[PDB]
Amino acid sequence: MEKYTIKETILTFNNEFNDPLDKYYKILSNPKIDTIEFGEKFNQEIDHLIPSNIKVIKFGWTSEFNKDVNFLTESLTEIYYGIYKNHSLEELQNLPKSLLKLKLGDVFNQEIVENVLPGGLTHLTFGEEFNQKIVENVLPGGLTHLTFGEEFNQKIVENVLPNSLTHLSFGDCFNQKITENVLPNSLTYLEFGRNFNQKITENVLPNSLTHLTFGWYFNQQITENVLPNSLTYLEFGRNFNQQITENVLPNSLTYLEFGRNFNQQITENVLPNSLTHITFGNNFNQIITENVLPNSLTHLTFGNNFNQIITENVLPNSLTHLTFGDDFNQIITENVLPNSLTHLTFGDDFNQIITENVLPNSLTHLTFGDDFNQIITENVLPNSLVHLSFGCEFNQEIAEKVLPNSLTYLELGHNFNQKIIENVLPNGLVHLSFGCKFNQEIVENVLPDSLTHLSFGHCFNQKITENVLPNSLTYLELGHNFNQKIIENVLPDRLTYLELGHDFNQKIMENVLPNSLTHLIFGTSFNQNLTENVLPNSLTHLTFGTCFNQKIIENVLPNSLTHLEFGPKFNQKITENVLPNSLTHLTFGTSFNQKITENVLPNGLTYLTFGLRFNQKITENVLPCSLTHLTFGWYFNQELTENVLPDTLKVLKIYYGNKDIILKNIDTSKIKFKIEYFNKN
């Protein structure tokens, strides 16, 4: 929060770092760093202050840097400038001939002429404001990637783009005609920006283009033999809404995406059989008939407005993924969904009855939307289904033979609150999740013993008695309102994770928590005293919630515990032999402010974090002898001495505002550990 940081090869300065570099040469000469990342505030000379090991200088788009730069290392290969950086043409002419990748500053807006940009450059990106003409032999001859900024809107004529270019991206304002032989024969990716709305005729798109993306305003017809036979990816923009007739989409296309406004009829022999992915935009709402969709289609996504009926032999037998939008709510009868379909997702509005042999026997994943709320009877859900998710409004009874034996994942939605009796949930269910409103009794032999994960929503607040929870349960999450006593022989023997909710605040007696539990999480309200042999001897992680503020005496915290987190309100004395010797990570909450004497903190503790309000003196032989990471809070305001800190210490985390008081008696220039500062904002 007040430093620089090294990761892999990239050194990143602080986002607030604005200091001269004269003294960092040593730091920057570290032979394992390739790049420097500067931030928002840095605005200092970098001319002769950069060793030649760093080959990439990335400034970050909001950088405040605007210094004249004329002596970059002749080993630089990449540099990217930010929003406030300008250039003179001299500066660009002084760029090193090693440069391969360049983003110009966003202020720059002067005509670049011949023999200015580095000749060997391969990647060029113009700044936001650049909008000057470009003529022949201006762009480096071996350029491969060219990206224009927002404001560029100048004509591009023949032989200005290198015949080596593969990637071309226009910005928001570009809107000039593109004529024959302007786009290089090597181009593969072409992206137009917001305002491009110009006709595209034959022999304009090269024979090598694979990816074509239009932007917001493009809305011109696409005629026969305009799209090359190499195109595999075609994405239209918001406004494109022209009819696509026969033989205009090439026979190589695999991905087709429409934008918001496309809403034209699609007849036969328009969608090439090669297409695997089709996505419609928001407004498409035209009927699709029998032999229209390609026979290779695997993925089909409708937009929010689509709501036309789908009859037999419309969906191809290749389709595996089908996703409906908000508005779809048409009846689906028997032989409509192909027998290849594995993933079916409905949108908000779908709420039609689904009868016997509508859902194909290949379906593995069925997701309903907000409104679905019809009864589901026997032989409706197929026997291949593993994953079933209901939406907010489903709230119908689920009878015995409704859910298939193959189901492993059941998620019930916000409003579901019907009774669940025996032989409803299939043996084999692994994940069961109840939504907000579920609050019905769960008696025994209801939850399948195969279940491992069980979580309840806001409202569940029913008793859990004996042999109710399945034998294989490893994960139990209780919700906001759960506040019932948990008794002996309720939690099963393989439970490792138990999370209690906001309201839970009942006493826990001795043989309640199983000796398999490793993780215990108390909610906001828990504030009951914990006594001896209550917490099991397997527990490694203990987290207290907001309100827990009871004194912990000896032989309460188990001898297995490694990670202890107190909550905001915990503020009780901790004396000798209370924290187990196994502890390695200890975190106090906001309000803890008690004196800590010697022989209290386990010596094997490695991570210690005090909270906001802690402010007690630290004397000798108080801090653990193994401690490596010590963090104090905002209000800590005590002198630390070198004889008080253990020799193992690696990192001390401190509030900057109080450094002068905390480090009064510490030569920062002779310590073996690293000091990290934090701010209030």
Side-chain angles (χ1 to χ4, degrees):
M1 190 165 188
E2 303 186 354
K3 207 176 52 154
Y4 75 81
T5 74
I6 290 175
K7 196 254 168 119
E8 290 169 338
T9 64
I10 304 188
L11 179 153
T12 306
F13 283 87
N14 216 109
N15 191 261
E16 305 289 313
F17 174 96
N18 190 15
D19 280 331
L21 302 176
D22 293 76
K23 215 194 178 193
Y24 286 79
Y25 205 98
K26 59 176 68 68
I27 296 166
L28 299 172
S29 302
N30 178 0
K32 210 48 142 116
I33 65 176
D34 275 323
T35 87
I36 293 172
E37 287 185 353
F38 288 105
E40 195 180 20
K41 292 290 186 175
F42 177 75
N43 192 22
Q44 301 294 334
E45 301 288 331
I46 61 111
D47 264 331
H48 300 91
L49 314 170
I50 303 290
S52 59
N53 58 333
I54 80 81
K55 308 203 294 300
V56 180
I57 296 178
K58 193 272 187 81
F59 271 98
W61 68 284
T62 63
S63 147
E64 302 188 4
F65 176 80
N66 191 14
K67 300 302 188 189
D68 293 51
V69 179
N70 285 271
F71 290 108
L72 283 316
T73 301
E74 194 70 58
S75 300
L76 255 203
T77 58
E78 315 188 7
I79 187 165
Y80 311 86
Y81 289 106
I83 190 74
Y84 281 130
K85 179 63 172 101
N86 203 343
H87 300 287
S88 82
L89 306 171
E90 173 156 303
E91 171 156 341
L92 303 184
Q93 210 159 347
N94 288 339
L95 290 173
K97 293 306 89 150
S98 59
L99 205 70
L100 298 170
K101 305 200 179 182
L102 167 68
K103 181 189 171 298
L104 298 168
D106 292 327
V107 176
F108 182 72
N109 188 20
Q110 297 167 62
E111 184 162 339
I112 296 173
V113 289
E114 185 171 0
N115 289 120
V116 181
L117 264 2
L121 202 76
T122 48
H123 289 61
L124 175 57
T125 295
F126 281 100
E128 190 184 306
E129 301 300 318
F130 177 85
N131 187 20
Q132 298 300 322
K133 307 186 167 46
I134 306 166
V135 297
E136 186 170 9
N137 293 116
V138 174
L139 301 173
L143 244 212
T144 56
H145 289 61
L146 177 65
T147 301
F148 284 103
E150 287 186 8
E151 292 305 324
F152 181 76
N153 189 17
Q154 297 301 323
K155 288 158 179 171
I156 297 101
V157 300
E158 206 178 0
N159 305 322
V160 309
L161 297 174
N163 57 36
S164 55
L165 203 75
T166 57
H167 289 67
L168 176 67
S169 306
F170 290 98
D172 287 339
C173 289
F174 179 76
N175 187 21
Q176 297 293 327
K177 183 56 183 280
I178 293 173
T179 65
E180 206 160 343
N181 305 102
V182 172
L183 299 174
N185 285 310
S186 50
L187 200 66
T188 64
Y189 285 56
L190 178 55
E191 182 172 349
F192 290 106
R194 204 180 57 187
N195 290 2
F196 178 82
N197 188 17
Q198 232 40 245
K199 282 167 168 53
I200 298 185
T201 62
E202 306 177 15
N203 300 315
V204 171
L205 296 176
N207 71 340
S208 52
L209 197 67
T210 59
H211 288 63
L212 177 59
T213 301
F214 293 107
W216 190 284
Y217 285 98
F218 179 80
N219 193 17
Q220 300 294 320
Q221 288 202 343
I222 307 296
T223 285
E224 294 173 11
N225 298 124
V226 177
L227 296 175
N229 284 325
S230 54
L231 207 70
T232 68
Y233 181 103
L234 180 59
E235 173 182 344
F236 291 108
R238 187 194 178 268
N239 288 0
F240 174 82
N241 195 19
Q242 297 295 315
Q243 269 207 353
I244 303 178
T245 61
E246 208 169 333
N247 287 102
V248 29
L249 299 176
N251 285 321
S252 41
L253 204 61
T254 59
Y255 285 60
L256 174 70
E257 175 168 0
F258 294 103
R260 177 170 181 278
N261 290 358
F262 177 86
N263 193 14
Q264 297 297 319
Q265 295 168 2
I266 305 176
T267 70
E268 314 174 22
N269 289 278
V270 176
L271 298 175
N273 283 322
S274 45
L275 279 169
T276 52
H277 294 61
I278 293 174
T279 297
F280 286 106
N282 202 295
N283 290 353
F284 178 81
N285 196 14
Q286 297 300 316
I287 186 74
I288 304 186
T289 60
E290 254 203 9
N291 293 101
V292 181
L293 294 176
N295 55 24
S296 305
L297 196 65
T298 61
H299 291 69
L300 179 56
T301 298
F302 287 107
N304 284 322
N305 290 2
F306 178 83
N307 193 16
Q308 299 298 307
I309 191 155
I310 311 179
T311 58
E312 293 186 347
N313 303 309
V314 172
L315 299 178
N317 288 297
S318 48
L319 194 70
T320 62
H321 290 74
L322 172 61
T323 303
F324 285 109
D326 288 333
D327 286 5
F328 184 85
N329 196 22
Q330 292 299 307
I331 290 169
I332 304 179
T333 54
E334 273 181 358
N335 298 112
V336 179
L337 304 172
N339 266 317
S340 170
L341 197 68
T342 61
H343 292 74
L344 177 58
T345 302
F346 287 105
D348 287 342
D349 290 1
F350 184 74
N351 189 20
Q352 297 301 312
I353 300 166
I354 290 165
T355 57
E356 303 249 317
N357 299 104
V358 175
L359 295 174
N361 274 315
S362 51
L363 204 71
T364 61
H365 292 75
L366 177 59
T367 298
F368 286 107
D370 286 355
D371 283 357
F372 182 77
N373 191 23
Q374 305 295 325
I375 71 183
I376 297 179
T377 66
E378 303 182 23
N379 296 100
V380 170
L381 299 172
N383 279 118
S384 46
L385 205 74
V386 309
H387 189 288
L388 176 60
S389 183
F390 289 101
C392 319
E393 305 221 20
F394 182 78
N395 191 19
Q396 301 302 319
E397 290 185 326
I398 308 182
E400 282 189 38
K401 269 71 222 276
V402 179
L403 299 172
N405 297 324
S406 54
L407 201 70
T408 61
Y409 180 102
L410 179 56
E411 171 178 8
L412 286 317
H414 192 276
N415 292 352
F416 183 89
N417 188 25
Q418 302 301 325
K419 305 189 205 292
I420 304 189
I421 61 171
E422 61 165 25
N423 289 96
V424 182
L425 303 169
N427 288 308
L429 195 73
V430 178
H431 283 82
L432 178 53
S433 186
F434 288 105
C436 178
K437 290 292 198 79
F438 179 82
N439 190 18
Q440 305 294 335
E441 286 179 33
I442 305 193
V443 305
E444 58 183 299
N445 297 115
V446 176
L447 302 171
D449 284 315
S450 63
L451 200 75
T452 59
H453 288 239
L454 175 61
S455 76
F456 292 88
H458 188 103
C459 292
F460 181 74
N461 188 23
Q462 300 297 331
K463 295 181 177 53
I464 308 176
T465 55
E466 299 191 43
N467 198 42
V468 170
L469 297 183
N471 306 132
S472 35
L473 200 69
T474 57
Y475 178 102
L476 174 58
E477 174 173 355
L478 295 151
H480 192 279
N481 288 1
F482 181 80
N483 193 18
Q484 302 301 318
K485 284 175 173 71
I486 309 190
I487 304 306
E488 200 150 352
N489 297 311
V490 175
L491 301 170
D493 296 328
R494 293 182 172 255
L495 184 55
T496 61
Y497 183 97
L498 173 66
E499 184 180 334
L500 298 150
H502 181 275
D503 290 359
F504 182 87
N505 192 19
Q506 299 301 309
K507 284 174 185 161
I508 310 187
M509 52 188 199
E510 274 177 51
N511 294 120
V512 174
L513 299 168
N515 285 296
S516 52
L517 198 71
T518 63
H519 290 68
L520 184 55
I521 305 285
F522 283 109
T524 296
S525 297
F526 180 76
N527 191 20
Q528 300 303 312
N529 181 64
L530 296 164
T531 59
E532 327 198 340
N533 306 122
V534 174
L535 297 179
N537 238 333
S538 52
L539 195 75
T540 64
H541 289 69
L542 182 60
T543 291
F544 285 107
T546 296
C547 288
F548 176 80
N549 191 25
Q550 298 304 304
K551 194 191 246 75
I552 297 160
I553 74 189
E554 299 94 314
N555 302 291
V556 174
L557 298 175
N559 281 302
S560 49
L561 202 75
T562 55
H563 297 59
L564 176 56
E565 178 178 352
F566 289 112
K569 282 198 173 133
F570 174 82
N571 189 28
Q572 298 296 320
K573 280 153 147 60
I574 303 172
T575 184
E576 286 87 345
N577 300 118
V578 184
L579 296 168
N581 278 321
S582 50
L583 212 60
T584 57
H585 296 65
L586 177 61
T587 295
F588 292 104
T590 58
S591 78
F592 175 87
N593 194 21
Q594 297 297 315
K595 293 147 101 198
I596 298 181
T597 61
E598 43 163 35
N599 299 321
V600 173
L601 300 179
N603 276 307
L605 199 66
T606 56
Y607 278 60
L608 184 55
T609 301
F610 297 96
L612 186 155
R613 294 182 167 282
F614 177 88
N615 186 196
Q616 303 293 320
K617 62 169 196 176
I618 300 295
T619 69
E620 299 193 16
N621 299 292
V622 171
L623 291 183
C625 301
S626 282
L627 190 128
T628 57
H629 291 67
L630 178 58
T631 300
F632 288 101
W634 197 5
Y635 290 177
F636 177 78
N637 203 34
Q638 300 297 126
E639 297 172 346
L640 290 172
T641 64
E642 296 217 19
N643 58 7
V644 153
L645 298 169
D647 295 325
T648 45
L649 187 66
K650 296 183 184 295
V651 174
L652 172 60
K653 180 80 88 80
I654 282 304
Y655 178 44
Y656 188 81
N658 288 319
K659 65 180 189 61
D660 294 340
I661 301 275
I662 304 166
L663 306 182
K664 191 202 180 88
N665 311 113
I666 291 167
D667 203 338
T668 66
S669 88
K670 294 174 183 284
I671 57 179
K672 285 143 129 55
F673 59 88
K674 170 245 199 79
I675 294 161
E676 285 179 16
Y677 298 120
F678 62 87
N679 283 119
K680 46 92 154 176
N681 206 319

PDB file of all heavy atoms in Angstrom, residues 437-454:
ATOM      1  N   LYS A 437     -36.506 -18.971   0.959  1.00  0.00           N
ATOM      2  CA  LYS A 437     -37.739 -19.174   1.701  1.00  0.00           C
ATOM      3  C   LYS A 437     -37.924 -20.571   2.285  1.00  0.00           C
ATOM      4  O   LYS A 437     -38.851 -20.763   3.082  1.00  0.00           O
ATOM      5  CB  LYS A 437     -38.949 -18.875   0.806  1.00  0.00           C
ATOM      6  CG  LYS A 437     -39.197 -17.426   0.429  1.00  0.00           C
ATOM      7  CD  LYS A 437     -39.616 -16.653   1.672  1.00  0.00           C
ATOM      8  CE  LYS A 437     -40.283 -15.343   1.309  1.00  0.00           C
ATOM      9  NZ  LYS A 437     -41.706 -15.660   0.907  1.00  0.00           N
ATOM     10  N   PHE A 438     -37.102 -21.551   1.924  1.00  0.00           N
ATOM     11  CA  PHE A 438     -37.357 -22.904   2.400  1.00  0.00           C
ATOM     12  C   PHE A 438     -37.286 -22.959   3.921  1.00  0.00           C
ATOM     13  O   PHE A 438     -36.304 -22.518   4.528  1.00  0.00           O
ATOM     14  CB  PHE A 438     -36.362 -23.897   1.811  1.00  0.00           C
ATOM     15  CG  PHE A 438     -36.571 -25.305   2.298  1.00  0.00           C
ATOM     16  CD1 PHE A 438     -37.526 -26.119   1.711  1.00  0.00           C
ATOM     17  CD2 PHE A 438     -35.831 -25.804   3.356  1.00  0.00           C
ATOM     18  CE1 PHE A 438     -37.724 -27.410   2.159  1.00  0.00           C
ATOM     19  CE2 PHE A 438     -36.027 -27.095   3.808  1.00  0.00           C
ATOM     20  CZ  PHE A 438     -36.973 -27.897   3.211  1.00  0.00           C
ATOM     21  N   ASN A 439     -38.330 -23.514   4.535  1.00  0.00           N
ATOM     22  CA  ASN A 439     -38.431 -23.586   5.988  1.00  0.00           C
ATOM     23  C   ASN A 439     -39.444 -24.650   6.394  1.00  0.00           C
ATOM     24  O   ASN A 439     -40.388 -24.366   7.136  1.00  0.00           O
ATOM     25  CB  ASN A 439     -38.825 -22.221   6.555  1.00  0.00           C
ATOM     26  CG  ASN A 439     -38.711 -22.162   8.061  1.00  0.00           C
ATOM     27  OD1 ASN A 439     -38.037 -22.986   8.676  1.00  0.00           O
ATOM     28  ND2 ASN A 439     -39.373 -21.188   8.668  1.00  0.00           N
ATOM     29  N   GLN A 440     -39.260 -25.872   5.902  1.00  0.00           N
ATOM     30  CA  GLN A 440     -40.083 -27.015   6.264  1.00  0.00           C
ATOM     31  C   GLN A 440     -39.240 -28.016   7.045  1.00  0.00           C
ATOM     32  O   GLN A 440     -38.014 -28.063   6.929  1.00  0.00           O
ATOM     33  CB  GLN A 440     -40.679 -27.686   5.023  1.00  0.00           C
ATOM     34  CG  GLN A 440     -41.469 -26.761   4.118  1.00  0.00           C
ATOM     35  CD  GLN A 440     -42.738 -26.242   4.768  1.00  0.00           C
ATOM     36  OE1 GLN A 440     -43.294 -26.872   5.671  1.00  0.00           O
ATOM     37  NE2 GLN A 440     -43.206 -25.088   4.308  1.00  0.00           N
ATOM     38  N   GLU A 441     -39.920 -28.829   7.849  1.00  0.00           N
ATOM     39  CA  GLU A 441     -39.225 -29.824   8.655  1.00  0.00           C
ATOM     40  C   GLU A 441     -38.513 -30.829   7.759  1.00  0.00           C
ATOM     41  O   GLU A 441     -39.013 -31.199   6.691  1.00  0.00           O
ATOM     42  CB  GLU A 441     -40.207 -30.558   9.565  1.00  0.00           C
ATOM     43  CG  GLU A 441     -40.702 -29.756  10.756  1.00  0.00           C
ATOM     44  CD  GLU A 441     -41.700 -30.532  11.601  1.00  0.00           C
ATOM     45  OE1 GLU A 441     -41.563 -31.772  11.700  1.00  0.00           O
ATOM     46  OE2 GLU A 441     -42.633 -29.907  12.147  1.00  0.00           O
ATOM     47  N   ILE A 442     -37.338 -31.272   8.193  1.00  0.00           N
ATOM     48  CA  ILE A 442     -36.604 -32.349   7.529  1.00  0.00           C
ATOM     49  C   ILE A 442     -36.458 -33.472   8.551  1.00  0.00           C
ATOM     50  O   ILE A 442     -35.638 -33.398   9.472  1.00  0.00           O
ATOM     51  CB  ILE A 442     -35.249 -31.899   6.983  1.00  0.00           C
ATOM     52  CG1 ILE A 442     -35.447 -30.698   6.059  1.00  0.00           C
ATOM     53  CG2 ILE A 442     -34.561 -33.032   6.246  1.00  0.00           C
ATOM     54  CD1 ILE A 442     -34.236 -30.349   5.225  1.00  0.00           C
ATOM     55  N   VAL A 443     -37.259 -34.525   8.389  1.00  0.00           N
ATOM     56  CA  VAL A 443     -37.219 -35.702   9.252  1.00  0.00           C
ATOM     57  C   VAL A 443     -36.173 -36.662   8.702  1.00  0.00           C
ATOM     58  O   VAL A 443     -35.470 -36.334   7.740  1.00  0.00           O
ATOM     59  CB  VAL A 443     -38.608 -36.359   9.335  1.00  0.00           C
ATOM     60  CG1 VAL A 443     -39.641 -35.329   9.789  1.00  0.00           C
ATOM     61  CG2 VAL A 443     -39.002 -36.962   8.002  1.00  0.00           C
ATOM     62  N   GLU A 444     -36.053 -37.845   9.297  1.00  0.00           N
ATOM     63  CA  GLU A 444     -34.975 -38.732   8.888  1.00  0.00           C
ATOM     64  C   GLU A 444     -35.363 -39.530   7.644  1.00  0.00           C
ATOM     65  O   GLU A 444     -36.532 -39.608   7.253  1.00  0.00           O
ATOM     66  CB  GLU A 444     -34.581 -39.687  10.016  1.00  0.00           C
ATOM     67  CG  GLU A 444     -35.688 -40.567  10.558  1.00  0.00           C
ATOM     68  CD  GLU A 444     -35.216 -41.424  11.725  1.00  0.00           C
ATOM     69  OE1 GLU A 444     -34.291 -42.241  11.529  1.00  0.00           O
ATOM     70  OE2 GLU A 444     -35.758 -41.264  12.839  1.00  0.00           O
ATOM     71  N   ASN A 445     -34.345 -40.119   7.017  1.00  0.00           N
ATOM     72  CA  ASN A 445     -34.477 -40.856   5.762  1.00  0.00           C
ATOM     73  C   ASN A 445     -35.024 -39.988   4.635  1.00  0.00           C
ATOM     74  O   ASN A 445     -35.582 -40.505   3.659  1.00  0.00           O
ATOM     75  CB  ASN A 445     -35.342 -42.105   5.946  1.00  0.00           C
ATOM     76  CG  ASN A 445     -34.732 -43.098   6.923  1.00  0.00           C
ATOM     77  OD1 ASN A 445     -35.292 -43.355   7.990  1.00  0.00           O
ATOM     78  ND2 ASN A 445     -33.570 -43.642   6.571  1.00  0.00           N
ATOM     79  N   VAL A 446     -34.875 -38.675   4.760  1.00  0.00           N
ATOM     80  CA  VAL A 446     -35.214 -37.733   3.698  1.00  0.00           C
ATOM     81  C   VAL A 446     -33.983 -37.353   2.891  1.00  0.00           C
ATOM     82  O   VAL A 446     -33.987 -37.421   1.662  1.00  0.00           O
ATOM     83  CB  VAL A 446     -35.897 -36.480   4.292  1.00  0.00           C
ATOM     84  CG1 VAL A 446     -36.162 -35.444   3.203  1.00  0.00           C
ATOM     85  CG2 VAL A 446     -37.188 -36.859   5.002  1.00  0.00           C
ATOM     86  N   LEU A 447     -32.920 -36.941   3.574  1.00  0.00           N
ATOM     87  CA  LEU A 447     -31.681 -36.579   2.905  1.00  0.00           C
ATOM     88  C   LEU A 447     -30.919 -37.841   2.525  1.00  0.00           C
ATOM     89  O   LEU A 447     -30.638 -38.666   3.399  1.00  0.00           O
ATOM     90  CB  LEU A 447     -30.837 -35.707   3.817  1.00  0.00           C
ATOM     91  CG  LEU A 447     -31.515 -34.415   4.276  1.00  0.00           C
ATOM     92  CD1 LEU A 447     -30.692 -33.717   5.345  1.00  0.00           C
ATOM     93  CD2 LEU A 447     -31.742 -33.491   3.087  1.00  0.00           C
ATOM     94  N   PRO A 448     -30.575 -38.032   1.249  1.00  0.00           N
ATOM     95  CA  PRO A 448     -29.850 -39.254   0.870  1.00  0.00           C
ATOM     96  C   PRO A 448     -28.465 -39.299   1.492  1.00  0.00           C
ATOM     97  O   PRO A 448     -27.756 -38.293   1.554  1.00  0.00           O
ATOM     98  CB  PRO A 448     -29.768 -39.154  -0.661  1.00  0.00           C
ATOM     99  CG  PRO A 448     -29.877 -37.677  -0.949  1.00  0.00           C
ATOM    100  CD  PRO A 448     -30.831 -37.149   0.097  1.00  0.00           C
ATOM    101  N   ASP A 449     -28.082 -40.491   1.957  1.00  0.00           N
ATOM    102  CA  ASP A 449     -26.788 -40.656   2.608  1.00  0.00           C
ATOM    103  C   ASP A 449     -25.627 -40.339   1.675  1.00  0.00           C
ATOM    104  O   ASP A 449     -24.516 -40.092   2.155  1.00  0.00           O
ATOM    105  CB  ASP A 449     -26.665 -42.081   3.151  1.00  0.00           C
ATOM    106  CG  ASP A 449     -27.475 -42.290   4.420  1.00  0.00           C
ATOM    107  OD1 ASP A 449     -27.423 -41.413   5.307  1.00  0.00           O
ATOM    108  OD2 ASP A 449     -28.173 -43.321   4.527  1.00  0.00           O
ATOM    109  N   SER A 450     -25.856 -40.325   0.358  1.00  0.00           N
ATOM    110  CA  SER A 450     -24.800 -39.976  -0.586  1.00  0.00           C
ATOM    111  C   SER A 450     -24.429 -38.499  -0.517  1.00  0.00           C
ATOM    112  O   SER A 450     -23.318 -38.129  -0.912  1.00  0.00           O
ATOM    113  CB  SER A 450     -25.232 -40.331  -2.011  1.00  0.00           C
ATOM    114  OG  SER A 450     -26.374 -39.585  -2.399  1.00  0.00           O
ATOM    115  N   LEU A 451     -25.334 -37.657  -0.030  1.00  0.00           N
ATOM    116  CA  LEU A 451     -25.127 -36.215  -0.036  1.00  0.00           C
ATOM    117  C   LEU A 451     -23.889 -35.824   0.762  1.00  0.00           C
ATOM    118  O   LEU A 451     -23.650 -36.322   1.864  1.00  0.00           O
ATOM    119  CB  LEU A 451     -26.355 -35.520   0.554  1.00  0.00           C
ATOM    120  CG  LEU A 451     -26.595 -34.049   0.241  1.00  0.00           C
ATOM    121  CD1 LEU A 451     -27.104 -33.883  -1.176  1.00  0.00           C
ATOM    122  CD2 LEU A 451     -27.567 -33.451   1.250  1.00  0.00           C
ATOM    123  N   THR A 452     -23.094 -34.921   0.186  1.00  0.00           N
ATOM    124  CA  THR A 452     -21.927 -34.370   0.860  1.00  0.00           C
ATOM    125  C   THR A 452     -22.043 -32.885   1.176  1.00  0.00           C
ATOM    126  O   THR A 452     -21.485 -32.440   2.181  1.00  0.00           O
ATOM    127  CB  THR A 452     -20.666 -34.594   0.010  1.00  0.00           C
ATOM    128  OG1 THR A 452     -20.837 -33.971  -1.268  1.00  0.00           O
ATOM    129  CG2 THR A 452     -20.402 -36.081  -0.177  1.00  0.00           C
ATOM    130  N   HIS A 453     -22.746 -32.108   0.356  1.00  0.00           N
ATOM    131  CA  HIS A 453     -22.867 -30.672   0.565  1.00  0.00           C
ATOM    132  C   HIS A 453     -24.325 -30.297   0.776  1.00  0.00           C
ATOM    133  O   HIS A 453     -25.179 -30.610  -0.058  1.00  0.00           O
ATOM    134  CB  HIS A 453     -22.310 -29.880  -0.614  1.00  0.00           C
ATOM    135  CG  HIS A 453     -20.821 -29.915  -0.718  1.00  0.00           C
ATOM    136  ND1 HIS A 453     -20.027 -28.793  -0.692  1.00  0.00           N
ATOM    137  CD2 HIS A 453     -19.978 -30.959  -0.785  1.00  0.00           C
ATOM    138  CE1 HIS A 453     -18.758 -29.150  -0.814  1.00  0.00           C
ATOM    139  NE2 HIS A 453     -18.708 -30.461  -0.916  1.00  0.00           N
ATOM    140  N   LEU A 454     -24.597 -29.608   1.882  1.00  0.00           N
ATOM    141  CA  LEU A 454     -25.938 -29.133   2.202  1.00  0.00           C
ATOM    142  C   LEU A 454     -25.843 -27.700   2.695  1.00  0.00           C
ATOM    143  O   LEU A 454     -25.059 -27.403   3.601  1.00  0.00           O
ATOM    144  CB  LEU A 454     -26.601 -30.020   3.260  1.00  0.00           C
ATOM    145  CG  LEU A 454     -27.964 -29.581   3.789  1.00  0.00           C
ATOM    146  CD1 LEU A 454     -29.005 -29.520   2.690  1.00  0.00           C
ATOM    147  CD2 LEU A 454     -28.412 -30.523   4.905  1.00  0.00           C
TER     148      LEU A 454
END
